[PDB]
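User: We ran a pulldown and think these components assemble together. Before we commit to crystallization trials, I'd like a predicted model of the whole complex to look at. Sequences follow.
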Amino acid sequence: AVKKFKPYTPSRRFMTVADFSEITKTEPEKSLVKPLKKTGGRNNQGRITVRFRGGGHKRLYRIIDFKRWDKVGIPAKVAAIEYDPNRSARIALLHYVDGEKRYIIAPDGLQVGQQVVAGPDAPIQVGNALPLRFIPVGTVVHAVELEPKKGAKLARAAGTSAQIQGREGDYVILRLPSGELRKVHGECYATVGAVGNADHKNIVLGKAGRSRWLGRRPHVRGAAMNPVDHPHGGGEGRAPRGRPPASPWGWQTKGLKTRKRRKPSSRFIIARR
Amino acid sequence: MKRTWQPNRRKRAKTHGFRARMRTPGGRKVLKRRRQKGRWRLTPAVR
RNA sequence: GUGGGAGAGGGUGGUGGAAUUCCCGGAGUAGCGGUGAAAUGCGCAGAUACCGGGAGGAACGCCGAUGGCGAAGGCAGCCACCUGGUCCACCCGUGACGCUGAGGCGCGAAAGCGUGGGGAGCAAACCGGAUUAGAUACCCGGGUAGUCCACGCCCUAAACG
RNA sequence: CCGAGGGUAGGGCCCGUGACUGGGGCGAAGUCGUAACAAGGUAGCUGUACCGGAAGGUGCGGCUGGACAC
RNA sequence: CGCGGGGUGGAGCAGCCCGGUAGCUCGUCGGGCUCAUAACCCGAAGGUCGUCGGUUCAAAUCCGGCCCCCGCAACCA
RNA sequence: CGGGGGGAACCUGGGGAACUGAAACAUCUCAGUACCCAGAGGAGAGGAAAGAGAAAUCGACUCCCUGAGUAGCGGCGAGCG
RNA sequence: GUGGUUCGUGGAGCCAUGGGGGAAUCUGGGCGGACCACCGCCUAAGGCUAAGUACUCCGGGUGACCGAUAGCGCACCAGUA
RNA sequence: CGAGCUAGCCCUGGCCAGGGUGAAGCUGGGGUGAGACCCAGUGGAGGCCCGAACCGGUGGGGGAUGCAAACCCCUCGGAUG
RNA sequence: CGAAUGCCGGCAUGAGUAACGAUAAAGAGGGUGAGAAUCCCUCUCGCCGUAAGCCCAAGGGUUCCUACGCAAUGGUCGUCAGCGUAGGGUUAGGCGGGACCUAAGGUGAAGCCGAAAGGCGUAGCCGAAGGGCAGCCGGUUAAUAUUCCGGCCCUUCCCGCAGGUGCGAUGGGGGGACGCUCUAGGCUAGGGGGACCGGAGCCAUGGACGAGCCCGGCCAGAAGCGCAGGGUGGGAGGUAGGCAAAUCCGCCUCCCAACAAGCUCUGCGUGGUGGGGAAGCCCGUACGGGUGACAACCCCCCGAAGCCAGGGAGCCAAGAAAAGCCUCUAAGCACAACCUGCGGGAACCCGUACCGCAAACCGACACAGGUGGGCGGGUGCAAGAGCACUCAGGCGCGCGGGAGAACCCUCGCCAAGGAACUCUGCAAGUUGGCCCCGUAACUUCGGGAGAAGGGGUGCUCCCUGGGGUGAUGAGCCCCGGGGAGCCGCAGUGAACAGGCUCUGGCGACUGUUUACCAAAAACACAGCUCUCUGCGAACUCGUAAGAGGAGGUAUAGGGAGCGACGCUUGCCCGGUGCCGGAAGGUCAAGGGGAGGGGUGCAAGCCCCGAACCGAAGCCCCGGUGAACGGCGGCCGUAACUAUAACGGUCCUAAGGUAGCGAAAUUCCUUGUCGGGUAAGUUCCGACCUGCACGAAAAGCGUAACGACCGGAGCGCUGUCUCGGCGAGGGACCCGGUGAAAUUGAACUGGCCGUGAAGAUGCGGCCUACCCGUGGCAGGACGAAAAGACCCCGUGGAGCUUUACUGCAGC
RNA sequence: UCGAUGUCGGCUCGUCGCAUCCUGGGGCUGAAGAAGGUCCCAAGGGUUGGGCUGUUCGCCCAUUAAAGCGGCACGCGAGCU
Ligand SMILES: [Mg+2]
Ligand SMILES: [Mg+2]
Ligand SMILES: [Mg+2]
Ligand SMILES: [Mg+2]
Ligand SMILES: [Mg+2]
Ligand SMILES: [Mg+2]
Ligand SMILES: [Mg+2]
Ligand SMILES: [Mg+2]
Ligand SMILES: [Mg+2]
Ligand SMILES: [Mg+2]
Ligand SMILES: [Mg+2]
Ligand SMILES: [Mg+2]
Ligand SMILES: [Mg+2]
Ligand SMILES: [Mg+2]
Ligand SMILES: [Mg+2]
Ligand SMILES: [Mg+2]
Ligand SMILES: [Mg+2]
Ligand SMILES: [Mg+2]
Ligand SMILES: [Mg+2]
Ligand SMILES: [Mg+2]
Ligand SMILES: [Mg+2]
Ligand SMILES: [Mg+2]
Ligand SMILES: [Mg+2]
Ligand SMILES: [Mg+2]
Ligand SMILES: [Mg+2]
Ligand SMILES: [Mg+2]
Ligand SMILES: [Mg+2]
Ligand SMILES: [Mg+2]
Ligand SMILES: [Mg+2]
Ligand SMILES: [Mg+2]
Ligand SMILES: [Mg+2]
Ligand SMILES: [Mg+2]
Ligand SMILES: [Mg+2]
Ligand SMILES: [Mg+2]
Ligand SMILES: [Mg+2]
Ligand SMILES: [Mg+2]
Ligand SMILES: [Mg+2]
Ligand SMILES: [Mg+2]
Ligand SMILES: [Mg+2]
Ligand SMILES: [Mg+2]
Ligand SMILES: [Mg+2]
Ligand SMILES: [Mg+2]
Ligand SMILES: [Mg+2]
Ligand SMILES: [Mg+2]
Ligand SMILES: [Mg+2]
Ligand SMILES: [Mg+2]
Ligand SMILES: [Mg+2]
Ligand SMILES: [Mg+2]
Ligand SMILES: [Mg+2]
Ligand SMILES: [Mg+2]
Ligand SMILES: [Mg+2]
Ligand SMILES: [Mg+2]
Ligand SMILES: [Mg+2]
Ligand SMILES: [Mg+2]
Ligand SMILES: [Mg+2]
Ligand SMILES: [Mg+2]
Ligand SMILES: [Mg+2]
Ligand SMILES: [Mg+2]
Ligand SMILES: [Mg+2]
Ligand SMILES: [Mg+2]
Ligand SMILES: [Mg+2]
Ligand SMILES: [Mg+2]
Ligand SMILES: [Mg+2]
Ligand SMILES: [Mg+2]
Ligand SMILES: [Mg+2]
Ligand SMILES: [Mg+2]
Ligand SMILES: [Mg+2]
Ligand SMILES: [Mg+2]
Ligand SMILES: [Mg+2]
Ligand SMILES: [Mg+2]
Ligand SMILES: [Mg+2]
Ligand SMILES: [Mg+2]
Ligand SMILES: [Mg+2]
Ligand SMILES: [Mg+2]
Ligand SMILES: [Mg+2]
Ligand SMILES: [Mg+2]
Ligand SMILES: [Mg+2]
Ligand SMILES: [Mg+2]
Ligand SMILES: [Mg+2]
Ligand SMILES: [Mg+2]
Ligand SMILES: [Mg+2]
Ligand SMILES: [Mg+2]
Ligand SMILES: [Mg+2]
Ligand SMILES: [Mg+2]
Ligand SMILES: [Mg+2]
Ligand SMILES: [Mg+2]
Ligand SMILES: [Mg+2]
Ligand SMILES: [Mg+2]
Ligand SMILES: [Mg+2]
Ligand SMILES: [Mg+2]
Ligand SMILES: [Mg+2]
Ligand SMILES: [Mg+2]
Ligand SMILES: [Mg+2]
Ligand SMILES: [Mg+2]
Ligand SMILES: [Mg+2]
Ligand SMILES: [Mg+2]
Ligand SMILES: [Mg+2]
Ligand SMILES: [Mg+2]
Ligand SMILES: [Mg+2]
Ligand SMILES: [Mg+2]
Ligand SMILES: [Mg+2]
Ligand SMILES: [Mg+2]
Ligand SMILES: [Mg+2]
Ligand SMILES: [Mg+2]
Ligand SMILES: [Mg+2]
Ligand SMILES: [Mg+2]
Ligand SMILES: [Mg+2]
Ligand SMILES: [Mg+2]
Ligand SMILES: [Mg+2]
Ligand SMILES: [Mg+2]
Ligand SMILES: [Mg+2]
Ligand SMILES: [Mg+2]
Ligand SMILES: [Mg+2]
Ligand SMILES: [Mg+2]
Ligand SMILES: [Mg+2]
Ligand SMILES: [Mg+2]
Ligand SMILES: [Mg+2]
Ligand SMILES: [Mg+2]
Ligand SMILES: [Mg+2]
Ligand SMILES: [Mg+2]
Ligand SMILES: [Mg+2]
Ligand SMILES: [Mg+2]
Ligand SMILES: [Mg+2]
Ligand SMILES: [Mg+2]
Ligand SMILES: [Mg+2]
Ligand SMILES: [Mg+2]
Ligand SMILES: [Mg+2]
Ligand SMILES: [Mg+2]
Ligand SMILES: [Mg+2]
Ligand SMILES: [Mg+2]
Ligand SMILES: [Mg+2]
Ligand SMILES: [Mg+2]
Ligand SMILES: [Mg+2]
Ligand SMILES: [Mg+2]
Ligand SMILES: [Mg+2]
Ligand SMILES: [Mg+2]
Ligand SMILES: [Mg+2]
Ligand SMILES: [Mg+2]
Ligand SMILES: [Mg+2]
Ligand SMILES: [Mg+2]
Ligand SMILES: [Mg+2]
Ligand SMILES: [Mg+2]
Ligand SMILES: [Mg+2]
Ligand SMILES: [Mg+2]
Ligand SMILES: [Mg+2]
Ligand SMILES: [Mg+2]
Ligand SMILES: [Mg+2]
Ligand SMILES: [Mg+2]
Ligand SMILES: [Mg+2]
Ligand SMILES: [Mg+2]
Ligand SMILES: [Mg+2]
Ligand SMILES: [Mg+2]
Ligand SMILES: [Mg+2]
Ligand SMILES: [Mg+2]
Ligand SMILES: [Mg+2]
Ligand SMILES: [Mg+2]
Ligand SMILES: [Mg+2]
Ligand SMILES: [Mg+2]
Ligand SMILES: [Mg+2]
Ligand SMILES: [Mg+2]
Ligand SMILES: [Mg+2]
Ligand SMILES: [Mg+2]
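Assistant: Here's a predicted model for the assembly, 320 residues in total across the polymer chains.
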């Protein structure tokens, strides 16, 4: 867990690296990779629409399987566990017995020797995937479809998960990583277990450059600009915010709630305290 | 010290070229103007 | 050695019910809290009291003792796994192989510390109400850390027989 | 060659001393309060933690060297 | 020099704006409870309102001069 | 069979500023101007009354003169008309 | 809700129409400046239509137009160097 | 009309003499009840060190109708990020 | 026209003045010619040599070669040239690109969107310094050559013959196909040496006829073979996956090899063959040609960063695509087709001169600037692409000759002193490489460290150790050890190499910045906190479609502040912001029609219109501080005095906690005291009276780090006392060429006055023959810039907000 | 004087005034002497080095015969900082 370093430089002092011993394979499965954009944070207009992105290691995109149900009931063996550098978590390689190979987000505890299956059939066991309706209540689970057949949007990040708090009608109540309580349709596939590589959160970048490697460019504060640039710009040397703190585009950035009021999605949410 | 003119033959025809001018309505009126003026060259001549 | 026994001894994983709290539904009205007496607080925006549903955390009533276990600190709902000490009966083996123990090593309540989780009740600090000459207290209404878990430190004590 | 010493340089220990600063001891009749000794008028003491003009207070846990009515 | 606010029983504050009437806490004094003291209880006393003009019938109150006090300001140079 | 693209200016349509004026300026003005776009053509537009507007009146449209800087419009201001 | 007209919300009709409602076929319908009556005018929701009009790349004619710093930027190998 | 200067990003290539320091890990030996750990060798990490190329532009002098509309000299910063 | 810093043009002044563009440097002889410092040839001298040499790409576009020229261009001259005229000159199946592939991006049948113009968009297409692809050595021209020629190799297409096979694709699968750092083995490039091989010739000036000196001792090459490496299992059964179908690939099982065994591919070697082939001498060359020669053509050593190459290990930040190629089958055809070998034929377009770190490209210039890839030899110094000298090659920078003043620049040295200089050791000095000894506080245990401070350093002889290569040997090459001696002032003998310590502030650190007056204490930064965001996310761009976010999903993403780490981060929710609140108040359009009005004879048509229902917003109720923010006044009091733990009272939403404090903050201020100094407005340590510190516009500390800013010491010095001398490049003189701002005109003195108040120009007096050269700056309110400061203008622009008004957005 | 009269201080170079800091010459003295005080004449010359601060001033150290005050665009930036 979380390799450290003696301080033979500054910043090798506090730097901290993942423990990679979970990883059984280095080259990824060539059949299953695609290239990346990458965007520099710019949209089709050439315009930066997300600030302070660029640089960063070249990356191959592992295509990964968020619909488990097209393969219902066909088991598969866990061949390898490897590094996906597009995501916080790790990818498991699955040889199916069709002979089809796919990548899955690797739940915490999944071993590579083992067998996994998806469908209502499906023993309730780490790595298996089921309609939410057939998971026993209280199970912790990840990679959840938000609507049926639409793919897994929820609890995919290293160490995340969700619990089933109960059922009502065609819907079941989940506690998301956020802690929002919301209804998800029972027909939505989820895959039992937590995500893991949960040690992820204790990495300590340790020096500026390591932030660059991840494609994050420097972030300059409103305080450091001039009034043209930012509601916090200007003053003579340093300065409180002088107004309720804002984004460069001018909206308040402390407490102001941005979620649209009237979304139909509101009928299906109960929480987030 | 590096100055502003760094000639490159492809940059010129990709930029001020005749097919450049014809692709954009802005650029067609460039030609239209230069033709109505009697310009001998309607477009940089790059070799 | 062999055959037996008692036990909250320890570590792990589960699990049950009672209660408090919060939320939803129902029903229902004008007060509920609280004290020496009060006030702050809470309540017609529907409180308290009552019934039903749900979430979550902590602690385990009766058994329970003037009891048991551990070297000490300490250890208490129930279940399983792993594991320490210890006593008894037979008189079977080894043959003084013992006792203590400067240093060393380990364990060491509470509180405190670090990184994470968790956070129901309680509650330093803090605010308010009251008392008072004052009241940076004692009583009352709030309330953060903490109390719980994991790993790691700290290593003190009326650590008392 | 070695060599009394001399010189240059960098350490160690010890003594004296120093604006000021920490507490401590002591000092016939100073100021503020009452913490403790009698249920000391909130039993006390206690390791620790936070607070507070001051003694001390409160939290958690511990010790008894505290306990004829309702 | 500037602009704004103030000066009232021993202390600290009201009242002045809107003229007539000076109030609150503390202190002080007389008495009480107590062995005594304080606390506490019952009573009292104590003032021309910085000053000097003016206005009015009447001035702490309005107007002016002076005197103090506090605050703000003194930039480009 | 046809279209496409070009054409000094002129024409119709779609869109459409500001300096400026108002001795400041927002309504207003400049101005439906400048400009951009689309279409025409040798012209274009318009055109044969669900019109005028006070006479029992005129009689499609376009252009000139006049009506007239009138009727009016107008931070009833500048000014527009 | 707006645009057009002289009409800037005005007593604001007329003409046009982005939105909502939504008829009738001569005893129907539009208009004459809110509106009502009366008296008149006119027949919307299809289309085309010469000429009188504008312009000047081009050709001609003519100047109390210039005459090489003028007159077109160019009298000249100029939208050139 | 401009990103042939410059700023960022994207795709694809290239460049960084030489020397110095000596992380983790590995191996052996020690150590222990098993550990922790200790030492040695090995190893060869790093917005590590010195220093060319390359990238800079610290201080000073010179230049100042310049060699130059930002240059020259000396000095100096980075030089596997 | 007389004025507008007017406009266009012409010509003046400055003035024969500055300058003639790197201080790498020249001298002579001969030739040519009307004419020669400047053109050509020779000799001598100097400069570059990780270049200032050579090759390639851009860009440039005939500048290339040659003949004839010198008006102009050339910073002088020109007989020369990149200049004028003319003629010539660029040769490809294999090199580069195109009749190949795809990347970003671009474009775009489908489709989506937008008043119009247009925007987007799957596939496809386009797009290259990336992938794919078959030429090596030499000779030849004045000028091109992997292009022509010679020699030896190879590719594709078409056709044919033969042999083989279920042939066949834009479809399936494999492959292509990948990072960074370190790196093994074997090669090659390149290099050093040889007593061996080959060669004109030399014995100078004292010595040397020598195992002397000087020069050279290679290159390309199919198959075959050799060495070194890369790639890679084979067989069968089953099969539901690879959007049809496969016998292929995937997967499961079984069966042999376990190995490069083999098969295969590449590198190097060798190879039939072909080709080069020095010095020197002669002639004769802008250039090179005879001979040397029938040249030799060999050993050893050093050795890549290059090759074998898809090698190996380690690491985390996790490292293109498509085609060629292989395989699999589908239609379809199985006379076809395809595979293999041989043979014949066919094989297009474009570039190809020349410059190319620069006089030919970008900088108006033959401009000290800028410009990507490759090669870049030798010796010495620890290494090296550093430094000095030097090969090859290339240059002496397109004005010169003299003189030997001031002065300037760049440089050398200095008695004694040693920072006294000065805002400041600014500047210059000192130090300086390697090896060895040694090395503090403090520390985050790495560091601090090159701390500091020292010693060594050459040459000769003797002895001796280990390595790589060979054999285990010599030879050669590498790393050392010990002993005795020699010379000088000095041995990193030249050149390239830190001055050091103490101690504060600020910033943790490396980084970033105002191109061109600021590199910093600013920005960034890892890290901490708040906050929004359930995913068609929030947020951003866009009218929209669409895109970014993200092919991400709360351990994520966005916004904000704070800024490693340590210890910490108090009180106030009155106001403002945000967050919650199903009541209440108010509230627009709309609903509602009480009543009222216009006009009709009237049915009616039309206009007002009270109650009441009626959102968000605001009000109202709460909460909220790593949200905007804000965190008291007067008076009294202790048995010297002083002060005030204590008290009183007024006010507040609450009255600044810890820590720190005359500070990057302190006015008074050079506060007071202490320390450093002979002397300290700075500095360090203290105190607290903090004008006007204070806790994430964070508080207080912190090892390490810094071209940051302060203070002190040592060392050392031309900074200074205080100046002197010397060098060179200028300045001066002569020959050639020859600018500039400025300029009302000038016949342009001093004092005391006067004057619009600072007079060459007016008054008075004084002084004063005409004209220059080199010099200095006191004045011509000198030049330059229609003053940036200041005000004015109902001038402008950027910025702000609880200014007005409006718009997007919500 | 705004179609420009560059500002503190320092350095360099001075020059002048005298209301004289020193030296020279004087009068008075509450001048014994030596040494002072005070006023008068006198502008020939002279008038230190250093610590602090940007300073001018000023304070301080060590001396001195003395450590003079002013003017010259608070002399002097086409002379330097
Ligand atoms: Mg675009
Ligand atoms: Mg970030
Ligand atoms: Mg930032
Ligand atoms: Mg700024
Ligand atoms: Mg703004
Ligand atoms: Mg601000
Ligand atoms: Mg600022
Ligand atoms: Mg400020
Ligand atoms: Mg560059
Ligand atoms: Mg190109
Ligand atoms: Mg032509
Ligand atoms: Mg024992
Ligand atoms: Mg403990
Ligand atoms: Mg505890
Ligand atoms: Mg009490
Ligand atoms: Mg007590
Ligand atoms: Mg007690
Ligand atoms: Mg007591
Ligand atoms: Mg307390
Ligand atoms: Mg100002
Ligand atoms: Mg129109
Ligand atoms: Mg105006
Ligand atoms: Mg005006
Ligand atoms: Mg204006
Ligand atoms: Mg108009
Ligand atoms: Mg129009
Ligand atoms: Mg006609
Ligand atoms: Mg017509
Ligand atoms: Mg006509
Ligand atoms: Mg028509
Ligand atoms: Mg209208
Ligand atoms: Mg109006
Ligand atoms: Mg109207
Ligand atoms: Mg009408
Ligand atoms: Mg009708
Ligand atoms: Mg109508
Ligand atoms: Mg009408
Ligand atoms: Mg009418
Ligand atoms: Mg009509
Ligand atoms: Mg009709
Ligand atoms: Mg004539
Ligand atoms: Mg002429
Ligand atoms: Mg002309
Ligand atoms: Mg003429
Ligand atoms: Mg002309
Ligand atoms: Mg660019
Ligand atoms: Mg760019
Ligand atoms: Mg290296
Ligand atoms: Mg290294
Ligand atoms: Mg480095
Ligand atoms: Mg370096
Ligand atoms: Mg510089
Ligand atoms: Mg300079
Ligand atoms: Mg100068
Ligand atoms: Mg990089
Ligand atoms: Mg005139
Ligand atoms: Mg002028
Ligand atoms: Mg003139
Ligand atoms: Mg002349
Ligand atoms: Mg002259
Ligand atoms: Mg001269
Ligand atoms: Mg000269
Ligand atoms: Mg020259
Ligand atoms: Mg020459
Ligand atoms: Mg060399
Ligand atoms: Mg000539
Ligand atoms: Mg020239
Ligand atoms: Mg050929
Ligand atoms: Mg060929
Ligand atoms: Mg080709
Ligand atoms: Mg073809
Ligand atoms: Mg293509
Ligand atoms: Mg293509
Ligand atoms: Mg497009
Ligand atoms: Mg389109
Ligand atoms: Mg292509
Ligand atoms: Mg290519
Ligand atoms: Mg290529
Ligand atoms: Mg090729
Ligand atoms: Mg050749
Ligand atoms: Mg086949
Ligand atoms: Mg590639
Ligand atoms: Mg070779
Ligand atoms: Mg001889
Ligand atoms: Mg070797
Ligand atoms: Mg590899
Ligand atoms: Mg790495
Ligand atoms: Mg393709
Ligand atoms: Mg068939
Ligand atoms: Mg060629
Ligand atoms: Mg050249
Ligand atoms: Mg260069
Ligand atoms: Mg080059
Ligand atoms: Mg030249
Ligand atoms: Mg040049
Ligand atoms: Mg370069
Ligand atoms: Mg060296
Ligand atoms: Mg040389
Ligand atoms: Mg030569
Ligand atoms: Mg000498
Ligand atoms: Mg000297
Ligand atoms: Mg000295
Ligand atoms: Mg200093
Ligand atoms: Mg210096
Ligand atoms: Mg020390
Ligand atoms: Mg040393
Ligand atoms: Mg020697
Ligand atoms: Mg040396
Ligand atoms: Mg040196
Ligand atoms: Mg050095
Ligand atoms: Mg300081
Ligand atoms: Mg910094
Ligand atoms: Mg660095
Ligand atoms: Mg910055
Ligand atoms: Mg700058
Ligand atoms: Mg600038
Ligand atoms: Mg600039
Ligand atoms: Mg810097
Ligand atoms: Mg932090
Ligand atoms: Mg938008
Ligand atoms: Mg995406
Ligand atoms: Mg900051
Ligand atoms: Mg508040
Ligand atoms: Mg609030
Ligand atoms: Mg509130
Ligand atoms: Mg009614
Ligand atoms: Mg409402
Ligand atoms: Mg705070
Ligand atoms: Mg406090
Ligand atoms: Mg202080
Ligand atoms: Mg001080
Ligand atoms: Mg302050
Ligand atoms: Mg200072
Ligand atoms: Mg201090
Ligand atoms: Mg502060
Ligand atoms: Mg703050
Ligand atoms: Mg500090
Ligand atoms: Mg520090
Ligand atoms: Mg730095
Ligand atoms: Mg720095
Ligand atoms: Mg000197
Ligand atoms: Mg000289
Ligand atoms: Mg004269
Ligand atoms: Mg005068
Ligand atoms: Mg005269
Ligand atoms: Mg002068
Ligand atoms: Mg001037
Ligand atoms: Mg005004
Ligand atoms: Mg204005
Ligand atoms: Mg002026
Ligand atoms: Mg002016
Ligand atoms: Mg001065
Ligand atoms: Mg006198
Ligand atoms: Mg005497
Ligand atoms: Mg004198
Ligand atoms: Mg004098
Ligand atoms: Mg100083
Ligand atoms: Mg002073
Ligand atoms: Mg001057
Ligand atoms: Mg100056
Ligand atoms: Mg001057
Ligand atoms: Mg002057």
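DSSP finds three helices and no strands in chain B. That may be worth checking against your pulldown data before setting up trials.

User: Thanks, that helps.
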